[PDB]
Design a protein around this ligand. Structure first.
Ligand code: F6C
Ligand code: CLA
Ligand code: CLA
Ligand code: CLA
Ligand code: CLA
Ligand code: CLA
Ligand code: CLA
Ligand code: CLA
Ligand code: BCR
Ligand code: LMT
Ligand code: PQN
Ligand code: SF4
Ligand code: CA
Lengths: 172, 717, 98, 31, 80, 46, 147, 41, 41
């Protein structure tokens, strides 16, 4: 009754062909579409310097973090005040997150680290295995998210001239 | 010891705890079900007898707008006859909130002998149930292949129990309840109402109420069914005299579902080759036979699942308790919004009590469905039957299921409840424009508002041209008024309704999280790899591994009872405030609606302070100002429910090691005066102290809400 | 140094984690006389092979709970199970029976 | 009158369904 | 780690060794009781502290006592 | 009537268990009265 | 016990200071009189410190009143639910973190549930903070708004 | 109306963002993705 | 006076800077310093 179980093909497989590992190979973690997308995100893109990983992660993140306080925050009744409070929110979150990245690296990499950053760890999802990769990612995320936030701030502060550009009103 | 006394009452009705033979277990179950039917028939005999002998039912049937229903009189001892309140019509009793009078009027009852002969028939059929339980156990008990005939049981319960039950009730509606309620709504007094057999003997007496009866049963057999379209109607809306549903819609309902259920009772193959079998339906639900969206369920699929239903009574009790929760939740939501009984919707004490009762019945049944799901996995589940099927694969990704549920519970708790704490803080600051409100930062429930607009546009008649009125007036349409009292009106949904619905989604998802983690980790976990060998119900596995208190599947049912209580209390509080604020009230002589609490749900229910002040503090003035009046039993039950809640925390917060060392000193003082007993005084066990603490917590909290709901609605409702 | 077929198993989310590769691991090896279904301590059902088996587990309590099931839930009993502790440098220590 | 804003947003949401089905047809046809 | 002490009231019934899910306890020959054997705790660094051995001990008071000590990864029962 | 003839013309094709014959006639006649009642009422209003 | 002591001191003195010392004398002999005339009657301006009608100087005491009711309720989680429920929940969260991409953090200290003694202490701390912040807000706001 | 691009249709902000997205924001990422696809070894 | 936080006491700019410093500027550096103190080996 159970003898022909595990003989027909199944789209759910043991993770890395090992049924003793505590994971499964699903379409969400192991299909060709999600592996092409996730492994080419700047956290995982092969060959990148740790700083350039941080710069792309920062520039994407600081850009959208200006957004929420501009539209729904306490300064939202005036345009110039809402853009400033959205910029300061993205600045404060970035400094706090990059302080957390730095003190993570100062705490984890003391001798041989415990857990996923140990020298024996086969953690494919956590590949930044040295402290100089973490400090360069910290500086990359800081500079990228500061730049992405002030880019969103400059676009939103000049929204009246930027809307006139995108409607051809500058050609009068 | 005294532990044997408590263990005997707890080991009473679980039958596989004895010698486990399935045929003898199935026979004790089949005859105990006859005994529980005799208890229901004995309780139904009491409600019809107290309705026939101790009521104002004949007085209430004359004018049901100004008479309060009473069916319980109280003896004059200890001064307790103050609870006999004036109901109108000179009758002194207790205002009942069960709605028996509105049920009996819609069924066709007109006198107090018809309720008497219904009470005799329930007293007779209770004696017939406790003979069938004796006969089918002590004399002629069936054997196991009779219990395992699923296809015959499904065919006989769809077509025979539900199909012939609702066809037979459609016979009572058409020949008794349709003429009796048509004459009552056209204003005919109760001396002039014919007794319900005269609508059959005098066939001509039903001709002038329904002219299609002169043409007989002949259009039914010739499929000229449109001849009957005056007593079987697809109307919709409410009766403007009673506020109930149209009785001709009720008859055509119980006709259409009768044909649909008798058709459903020919689906399964029993003795004649025709039909589907349960095994062939379950052995085919697998890859590659399913849709390609469901390729994840694998090649075995549902193939090993029919051995569950061959052997496990607990697994069938798990499904059936869940669906009685689904049915009782439908009974709660559909009977307030489509009120099916005459003069029900304007009896606000009854609409409150009927919603609240059937919500609470459903919530206990859902916890029992998860409790007996965990009993099946511990006791009845054999892993050899389930290799790579949907039961085995669910247990092999239980860490993904519980951790994804734990995330969405945290998301729902932040994005529902912490927005109330945002709103409390913004209002205290004097920044109401920064609140989540209809006048601040709006959260319009646009998908529910879209459904309400669809449900109104469907009748006209874009997608249901056959109705005249709406399916419910809660969706749209207009105001239905009975006796200058609102029966049902459109229920507007704003930011306060977006927030409370995501509170409900939060508290249900956590209750699922407590119960599903108890079921999925009932046999083993990374902490206790042999948890199933310790049983379904055990206190812990010692203070080691950090501490393993409440790892058993029983203790997750214990924690799930608190979370069900917390979930359903907010559900009935949402109902009680929103109906008083936006639905119930009075149509004035001007033409304007003045609700009970005046429309304050939209602005005050968005903070915790408004629920404390405008709901809890304001509306409890009837239950605390009831001393020295007829509602004083509610005032005593209000404080009594507060007592048992605080009393329950002695059992929940403490442990039995304290109480056992406290007992030895009292055992010492009893021994110095030579009055010792043989049965040795023990503290309650760790599981007994949890069971006592959760039972008194739920009793204390529900009785408090019951006294608060019923004292307010018996005064101003 | 450790012989045995891995039991037929589709994998689960209850198996080995980061601790198994960086601190310590455990393996239980037993012989069976027939192909039969057992319950994994990590949840679910696996199929042991006729002959020598080998299963890697995360805790020593999971291997001893499997050996308790092998001694008590199968006729004939499976008593010959050996439990090892595997260190990340490959150093294998024989811990049960001692 | 012409389309409403809810009609345009319905068409944009529905068009994600042939966008996904063309992606899985393109990757099935080959690389 | 925890501390598992075996006292000389042990009647050598081997029930603590059968109850232990971590194989902490074994029987050694003693000549101090009728059964000729006493419980010992050699692998006490594997003890999780479940106290299943004390639940199994028939001697009044218990011949085996577990003292919860310093928490390690093994004594906390962590698979992660 | 023409739906009952359709039932005995296209449901000697669909049924694995035929003959336990007597009762799949009663099933095929029952489905003819079901599809007959739906089509007569369907054609009754077009 | 100190709840019963300070309830009696406050209700007797609120009756003496208002001149309504008689109203203490019929109502203090039954428990509804403490419930209706001390707890319910003196809560009226405290819970109106902010409302849809506006905010006033009792708003910090109304907010602390709900804050104290909240901390008392968080207490019941630590006192009714015990350890091994939470320890098995943390293993599923430790599973989810290890198998989630882009989550580069990893706990240096292994996450465990709070110990049996610790959550009796944590639950008693939330109970006590919830006890004192509730009554302390009620004692200030009911006395200072009546006098 | 006559001095700049407007739209008298439903959601007139949609061409305001879609034509920048389709024609000069997304093409260089799409050209870079296609370039990495045809150069990979 | 009634529209914003003012101070009619000496050095009213002191709560203008001390409450930002004490409550949301300095705590995350202090939490980071304490975190490095309790994690160091
Ligand atoms: C650090 C690192 C890390 C990471 C990375 O890296 C992470 C991540 C994850 C993911 C994966 C997920 C999803 C996300 C979410 O949604 O959720 C929220 C959260 C958050 C938001 C958190 C996050 C955090 C971030 C990332 C960081 C930040 C930091 C700051 C900013 C700094 C500052 C500094 C100063 C000094 C203060 C998760 C989660 C969870 N958690 Mg988990 N994390 C962690 C941390 C932590 C800690 C400490 C604790 C204790 C409290 C916990 C807890 C928890 C719980 C209960 C849960 C859940 O439920 C979830 C889950 O599982 O689902 C499924 N967790 N997380
Ligand atoms: C059409 C015939 C028929 C009918 C009406 C029923 C009805 C019932 N069966 Mg079922 N049963 C049937 C055929 C039928 N059975 C067959 C053929 C099998 C073998 C496959 C079974 C095997 C079976 C088992 C193992 C069990 C039942 C149970 C039940 C009860 C459901 C639980 C309940 O409380 O219902 C709700 C009750 C009502 C809706 C009220 C109406 C029911 C009345 C009071 C029953 C007595 C009247 C009369 C006998 C029914 C009308 C027939 C009469 C006109 C000739 C219900 C009385 C359960 C039970 O409770 O047993 C006592 C149960 O455990 N049945
Ligand atoms: C299922 C329960 C039930 C029962 C016991 C009855 C019983 C009866 N019907 Mg009724 N009837 C029913 C359901 C039922 N009906 C339903 C569901 C419909 C709608 C299709 C009708 C529509 C109907 C009509 C139009 C008439 C009857 C009539 C009758 C009476 C004579 C029938 C006869 O002798 O042949 C008999 C009392 C006849 C009668 O005498 O009216 C009082 C009659 O003219 N019935
Ligand atoms: C059709 C419904 C149904 C059926 C047939 C069963 C049957 C069973 N249940 Mg299940 N269960 C159900 C619903 C049901 N239950 C529901 C709704 C819940 C959620 C509360 C549960 C949760 C549950 C748990 C947690 C357990 C069971 C167990 C059992 C088994 C033994 C029962 C026993 O010995 O208690 C005998 C009855 C009592 C001891 C009565 C006590 C009930 C409460 C505390 C008192 C009533 C309060 C009252 C309404 C308030 C008035 C107070 C006033 C009088 C002062 C038996 C197979 C047990 C078992 O052994 O499974 C292996 C077990 O541990 N059930
Ligand atoms: C009011 C008291 C209170 C509060 C705040 C909590 C909070 C929680 N319970 Mg608990 N619980 C309580 C009473 C309470 N419980 C009681 C009395 C019992 C005994 C029956 C339990 C038994 C219990 C069980 C059995 C479970 C929970 C779980 C949870 C978590 C649910 C997830 C969530 O909503 O995240 C959002 C967090 C909140 C809503 C907390 C308040 C956050 C504030 C509003 C934000 C402001 C803070 C600010 C940033 C600080 C600066 C959450 C931490 C569950 C869990 O862990 O799910 C993953 C779970 O399974 N509780
Ligand atoms: C969500 C989709 C939905 C649902 C649940 C319904 C439901 C219903 N339709 Mg409707 N219908 C729909 C979409 C829907 N319709 C659409 C898109 C159209 C084309 C405009 C119609 C055109 C239509 C007609 C012409 C009729 C129904 C009728 C009905 C009713 C019974 C018959 C049936 O077909 O079922 C039932 C309430 C019938 C009815 O009015 O029953 C009384 C009927 O005559 N429908
Ligand atoms: C082949 C001939 C035929 C024709 C012309 C029709 C035509 C019709 N049927 Mg009928 N029907 C048929 C065969 C046919 N049917 C068969 C073989 C059955 C199985 C017995 C049915 C069972 C059936 C039911 C139960 C109902 C209809 C209904 C309808 C009407 C409205 C359906 C609609 O537009 O809803 C559009 C909306 C949807 C389809 C939902 C989305 C329409 C006149 C409905 C009706 O008459 O309501 C007034 C209705 O309730 N049909
Ligand atoms: C321990 C006694 C004590 C307490 C509980 C407070 C409490 C407060 N002070 Mg005050 N402060 C104190 C002593 C104290 N102060 C002393 C002795 C001085 C003179 C140096 C000050 C100088 C001072 C200024 C200039 C300001 C405050 C302010 C405040 C308020 C906001 C918190 C803050 O920003 O502090 C800031 C704290 C300081 C600048 C110095 C604190 C010096 C004490 C001795 C440290 C105590 C450490 C403690 C014992 C360790 C535990 C809060 C009411 C703010 C305010 O009034 O807003 C409305 C504000 O602007 N305080
Ligand atoms: C839908 C979808 C999705 C998603 C996506 C998303 C989520 C997006 C995002 C987006 C974003 C999130 C974006 C970002 C952007 C950013 C940027 C692009 C930035 C830039 C920057 C700059 C430019 C800056 C500069 C500077 C500096 C650096 C310094 C100095 C100053 C200045 C300002 C000059 C996916 C794919 C999943 C899938 C499919 C669909
Ligand atoms: C589980 C559900 C998750 C819920 C997530 C909730 C997150 C926060 C919700 C805010 C998002 C929507 O919030 C939306 O914002 C706009 C802009 O302020 C509000 O806009 C409204 O208030 C602002 C006040 O300045 C005015 O500019 C605007 O004229 C008015 O319409 C809308 O009332 C609100 O609907
Ligand atoms: C108070 C308390 C006790 C003590 C409670 C006890 C001992 C219950 C005693 C109840 C019995 C029924 C008292 C009555 C004894 C006789 C039955 C009296 C006969 C009276 C009849 C003639 C009416 C525990 O044992 C306990 C255990 C675990 C956690 C918490 C607690 C806990 O809080
Ligand atoms: S405190 Fe009680 S329930 Fe918890 S481990 Fe100890 S004995 Fe068991
Ligand atoms: Ca503002």
């Amino acid at each position: 009754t159970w003898v022909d179980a595990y003989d027909q093909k199944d789209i759910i497989q043991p993770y890395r062909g090992n049924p003793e590992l505590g994971n499964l190979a699903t379409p969400v973690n192991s299909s060709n579409l999600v592996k092409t997308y996730i492994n080419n995100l700047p956290a995982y893109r092969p060959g990148l310097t740790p700083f350039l990983r941080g710069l792309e992660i920062g520039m994407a993140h600081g850009y959208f973090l200006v957004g929420p306080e501009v539209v729904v925050g306490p300064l939202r009744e005036t345009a110039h005040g809402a853009n400033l409070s959205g910029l300061i929110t993205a600045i404060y979150i970035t400094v706090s997150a990059c302080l957390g990245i730095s003190i993570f690296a100062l705490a984890t990499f003391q001798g041989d680290p415990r857990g996923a950053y140990n020298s024996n760890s086969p953690d494919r999802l956590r590949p930044l295995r040295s402290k100089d990769g973490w400090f360069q990612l910290s500086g990359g995320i800081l500079l990228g998210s500061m730049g992405g936030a002030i880019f969103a701030y400059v676009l939103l502060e000049n929204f009246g001239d930027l809307d006139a550009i995108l409607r051809g009103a500058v050609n009068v | 010891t005294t532990t044997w006394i408590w263990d005997l009452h707890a080991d009473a009705h679980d039958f596989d705890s004895h010698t486990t033979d399935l045929e003898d277990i199935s026979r004790k179950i089949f005859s105990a079900h006859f005994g529980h039917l005799a208890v229901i028939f004995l309780w139904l005999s009491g409600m019809y007898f107290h309705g026939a002998r101790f009521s104002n039912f004949s007085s209430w049937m004359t004018d049901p707008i100004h008479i309060k229903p009473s069916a319980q009189v109280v003896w004059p001892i200890f001064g307790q006859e103050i609870l006999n309140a004036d109901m109108g019509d000179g009758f002194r009793g207790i205002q009942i909130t069960s709605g028996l009078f509105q049920m009996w009027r819609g069924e066709g009852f007109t006198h107090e002998f018809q309720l008497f002969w219904t009470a005799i028939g329930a007293l007779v059929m209770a004696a017939l149930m406790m003979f069938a339980g004796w006969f089918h156990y002590h004399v002629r008990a069936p054997k196991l292949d009779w219990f395992r005939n699923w296809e015959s049981m499904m065919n006989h319960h769809l077509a025979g129990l539900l199909g012939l039950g609702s066809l037979g009730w459609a016979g009572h509606l058409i020949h008794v309840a349709l003429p009796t309620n048509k004459l009552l709504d056209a204003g005919v007094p109760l001396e002039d109402i014919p007794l319900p057999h005269e609508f059959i003997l005098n066939k001509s007496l039903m001709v002038d109420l329904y002219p299609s009866f002169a043409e007989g049963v002949k259009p039914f057999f010739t499929l000229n069914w449109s001849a009957y379209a005056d007593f079987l109607t697809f109307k919709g809306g409410l009766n403007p005299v009673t506020g109930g549903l149209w009785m001709t819609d009720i008859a055509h309902h119980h006709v259409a579902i009768a044909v649909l259920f008798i058709i459903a009772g020919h689906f399964y193959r029993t003795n004649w080759g025709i039909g589907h079998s349960f095994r062939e339906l379950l052995d085919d639900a697998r890859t590659p036979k399913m849709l390609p969206i469901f390729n994840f369920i694998g090649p075995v699929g549902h193939r090993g699942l029919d051995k569950i239903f061959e052997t496990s009574w607990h697994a069938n009790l798990a499904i059936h308790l869940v669906q009685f929760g689904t049915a009782s939740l439908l009974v709660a939501h559909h009977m307030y919004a489509m009120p099916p009984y005459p003069y029900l919707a304007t009896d606000y004490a009854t609409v409150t009590s009927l919603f609240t009762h059937h919500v609470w019945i459903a919530g206990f049944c859902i916890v029992g469905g998860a409790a007996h799901a965990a009993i099946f996995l511990v006791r009845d589940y054999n892993p050899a039957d389930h290799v790579n099927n949907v039961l085995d694969r669910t247990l092999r990704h239980r860490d993904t299921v519980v951790s994804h549920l734990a995330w969405v519970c945290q998301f729902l708790g932040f994005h529902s409840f912490a927005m109330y704490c945002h709103n409390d803080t913004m209002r205290a600051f004097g920044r109401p424009q920064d609140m989540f409100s209809d006048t601040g930062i709006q959260l319009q429930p646009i998908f529910a508002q879209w459904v309400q607009q669809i449900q109104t546009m469907a009748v006209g008649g874009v997608t249901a041209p056959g109705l005249g009125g709406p399916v419910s007036h809660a969706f749209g349409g207009g105001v239905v008024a009975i006796g200058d009292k609102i029966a049902m009106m459109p229920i507007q949904l704003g930011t306060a309704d977006f927030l409370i619905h995501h509170i409900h989604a939060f508290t249900i998802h956590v209750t699922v999280l407590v119960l599903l983690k108890g079921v999925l980790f009932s046999r083993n976990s990374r902490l206790i790899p042999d948890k199933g060998e310790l049983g379904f119900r055990f206190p812990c596995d010692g203070p080691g591994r950090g501490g393993t208190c409440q790892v058993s599947a029983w203790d997750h049912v214990f924690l799930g009872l608190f979370w069900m209580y917390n979930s359903l209390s907010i559900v009935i509080f949402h109902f009680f405030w929103k109906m008083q604020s936006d639905v119930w009230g009075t149509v004035g002589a001007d033409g304007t609606i003045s609700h009970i609490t005046g429309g304050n749900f939209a602005q005050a229910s968005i903070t915790n302070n408004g629920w404390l002040r405008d709901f809890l503090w304001a509306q409890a003035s009837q239950v605390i100002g009831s001393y020295g009046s007829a509602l004083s039993a509610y005032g005593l039950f209000f404080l009594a429910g507060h007592f048992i809640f605080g009393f329950s925390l002695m059992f929940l917060f403490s442990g039995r090691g304290y109480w056992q060392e406290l007992i030895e000193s009292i055992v010492w003082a009893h021994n110095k005066l030579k009055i010792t007993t043989a049965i040795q005084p023990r503290a309650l066990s760790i599981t007994q102290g949890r069971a006592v603490g959760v039972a008194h917590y739920l009793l204390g909290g529900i009785v408090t809400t019951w006294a608060f709901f019923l004292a307010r609605m018996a005064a101003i409702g | 140094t450790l012989t045995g077929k891995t039991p037929v198993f589709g994998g689960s989310t209850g198996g080995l984690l980061t601790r198994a590769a960086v601190e310590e691991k455990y393996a239980i090896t037993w012989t069976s006389t027939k192909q039969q279904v057992f319950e994994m301590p990590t949840g679910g059902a696996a199929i042991m092979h006729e002959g020598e088996n080998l299963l890697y587990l995360a805790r020593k309590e999971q291997c001893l709970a499997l050996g308790t099931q092998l001694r008590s839930k199968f006729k004939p009993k499976i008593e010959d199970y050996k439990i090892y502790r595997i260190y990340p440098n490959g150093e294998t220590q024989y811990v049960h029976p001692a | 009158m012409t389309l409403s804003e809810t009609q345009v947003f319905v068409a944009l949401v529905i068009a994600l369904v042939p966008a996904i089905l063309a992606f899985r047809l393109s990757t099935e046809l080959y690389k | 780690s925890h501390s598992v002490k075996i006292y000389d009231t042990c009647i050598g019934c081997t029930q603590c060794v059968r109850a232990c899910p971590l194989d902490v306890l074994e029987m050694v020959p003693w000549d101090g009781c009728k059964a000729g054997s006493i419980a010992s705790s050699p692998r006490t660094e594997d003890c999780v502290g479940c106290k299943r051995c004390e639940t199994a001990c028939p001697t009044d008071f218990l011949s085996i006592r577990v003292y919860l000590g310093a928490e390690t990864t093994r004594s906390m029962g962590l698979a992660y | 009537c023409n739906l009952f003839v359709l039932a005995i013309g296209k449901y000697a094709i669909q049924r694995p268990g035929a003959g336990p014959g007597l009762p799949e006639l009663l099933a095929t006649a029952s489905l003819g009265h079901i599809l007959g009642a739906g089509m007569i009422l369907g054609l009754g209003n077009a | 016990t100190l709840g019963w002591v300070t309830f009696y001191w406050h209700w007797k003195h609120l009756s003496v200071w208002s001149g309504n010392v008689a109203q203490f004398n019929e109502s203090s002999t039954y428990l509804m009189g403490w419930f209706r005339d001390y707890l319910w009657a003196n809560s009226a301006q405290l819970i109106n410190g902010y409302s849809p009608a506006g905010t006033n100087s009792l708003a910090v005491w109304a907010w602390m009143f709900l804050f104290g009711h909240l901390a008392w309720a968080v207490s019941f989680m630590f006192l009714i639910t015990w350890r091994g429920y939470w320890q098995e929940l943390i293993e599923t969260l430790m599973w989810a973190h290890e198998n989630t991409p882009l989550s580069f953090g990893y706990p240096k200290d292994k996450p465990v549930a709070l110990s049996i003694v610790q959550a009796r202490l944590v639950g008693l701390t939330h109970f006590t903070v919830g006890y004192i912040a509730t009554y302390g807000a009620f004692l200030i706001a009911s006395t200072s708004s009546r006098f | 109306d006559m001095t700049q691009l407007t739209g008298a249709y439903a959601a007139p902000w949609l061409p305001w963002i879609m034509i920048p997205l389709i024609f000069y924001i997304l093409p260089f990422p799409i050209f870079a993705i296609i370039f990495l696809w045809i150069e990979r070894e």
